[PDB]
Symmetry: C3
Subunit: 173 residues, 3 copies
């Protein structure tokens, strides 16, 4: 059973993150990662009971002294695939900038692109049409990241599409 | 009467932001946006009484649940022009990076460059002469942003120049 | 006696920062700069008693009103050389992005590359092998920064090597 890491960043579409997790739970073992901002839009009670939710604070529950496991490193090794849905314009920019100041971006900055990484951008039309969207998505493409396009613009792809896109890929490999 | 959005970021020159707003109030309808760091140098009592000042917290006064208006989107649509004076080296870098973690940078990341956007950089000479200044300003130029050059170096352009530069442009269009 | 600014950013290797300072104290006048995250791994009591340690808060102890000295500017002028050991992946990215949101990155964003700046990256192997490492280090190289390579991968270079590398350079100039 594939290990799928699902992540949410600060887009209003994170309100659908619980449902997205539900779409993956039967087929895969699911763990969730959220940014602080995503918590403004996500209700934890909407998530499957079996899914462990990790936040920035969890980095310090795992590590306390030298030698201990570093959570972003353990999740990166554990995952067969990472799906960021929603991917906010800010996190999109931080990924393109190679920055890492929280659990999600640390996992990504430690990423080995031999492993599949999918993103479902979700942002207002004005940010979607702004020039940095095409610039950063182009950079993510070069890295090997797979874009699950928003719905026409910038609204997050539907959970069912995110799920079937990842499932079809896995079964083909 | 043109709608002018005036913004201040974390430079000591933000102490002059109130006066800058005063220069624009008769000619335009003015709204102000400040970053958290700019508040170290700006005195709110120096602003025109008629000017509404928006901060990061205001994003949450406008939005509470799905469907509500998102402040950075409403200000971006409302504005005929955006003027950032002072523009700090940090915000300059975030703009060039397509990042958005506060009200000001969210407005900019949602910007449609068909609308004029002027910047008045303000930083110590050492930061002004540092290589990233020319690199980021070059990127802003390509986007279509209009630079109001600092005074010789890196001291913010005088409010009167910022004002006449924006006014002359508007009247020509 | 050369003025050496030693800095630590958020890597576990910062636990060795006190010892690194000790390596430099006899030969140079040493001042230390730390990021907030580095404080998770550094024990202040491990530092030489004679070394003043500066943090982000110190920026506000030095400056209170217009005209006062700005600490990152004073340290940049004071230093003959800057050594960042450890350099985290995040600070590496912020340097390459020309960003400055804390004392360390403000000093760097104000840097005049005629003065030597050495970096000793320290990060988990997964981050070291990630594509942004080579990309950002390449950018730092172009600026004139001198890389003191990690030990095979990504573990920080030993303090003795960091010290002799800086000392040999100085004595040659
Ligand atoms: C009410 C509101 C709704 C937002 N909606 C979105 C959105 O749909 N997509 C997006 O990319 N950013 C959106 N933003 C801006 C992000 O929340 C902001 O850039 C944030 O810093 C991103 O944090 P993160 O990327 O670390 O999760 C919104 C902001 C607010 C206040
Ligand atoms: C006392 C002091 C004065 C500063 N003056 C300036 C300045 O004139 N210009 C600048 O670009 N940054 C200056 N900085 C650094 C910025 O305040 C810092 O990069 C900040 O993170 C920028 O925040 P913002 O861009 O989100 O407003 C100063 C810092 C301090 C502590
Ligand atoms: C327990 C733990 C250990 C970490 N070890 C490292 C490390 O060795 N190198 C690194 O580059 N980042 C490491 N990180 C991630 C950084 O601490 C993180 O990117 C941080 O935001 C960097 O802050 P700074 O660059 O402003 O100091 C670690 C994180 C945690 C929670």
């Amino acid at each position: 059973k594939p290990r799928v890491l699902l992540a949410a960043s600060g887009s209003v579409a994170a309100i659908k993150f619980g449902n997205l997790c539900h779409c993956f739970t039967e087929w895969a073992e699911v763990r969730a990662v959220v940014t602080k901002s995503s918590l403004h839009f996500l209700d934890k009670l909407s998530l499957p009971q079996e899914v462990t939710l990790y936040t920035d604070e969890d980095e310090w529950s795992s590590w306390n002294k030298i030698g201990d496991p570093v959570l972003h490193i353990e999740l990166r090794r554990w995952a067969d695939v990472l799906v960021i849905a929603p991917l906010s314009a800010n996190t999109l920019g931080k990924i393109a900038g190679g920055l890492c100041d929280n659990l999600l971006t640390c996992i990504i900055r430690a990423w080995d692109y031999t492993k599949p990484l999918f993103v479902a951008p979700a942002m207002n039309t004005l940010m979607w049409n702004n020039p940095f969207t095409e610039r950063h998505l182009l950079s993510l493409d070069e890295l090997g990241i797979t874009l699950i396009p928003p719905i026409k613009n910038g609204a997050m792809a539907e959970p069912s599409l995110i799920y079937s896109t990842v499932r079809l890929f896995w079964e083909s490999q």
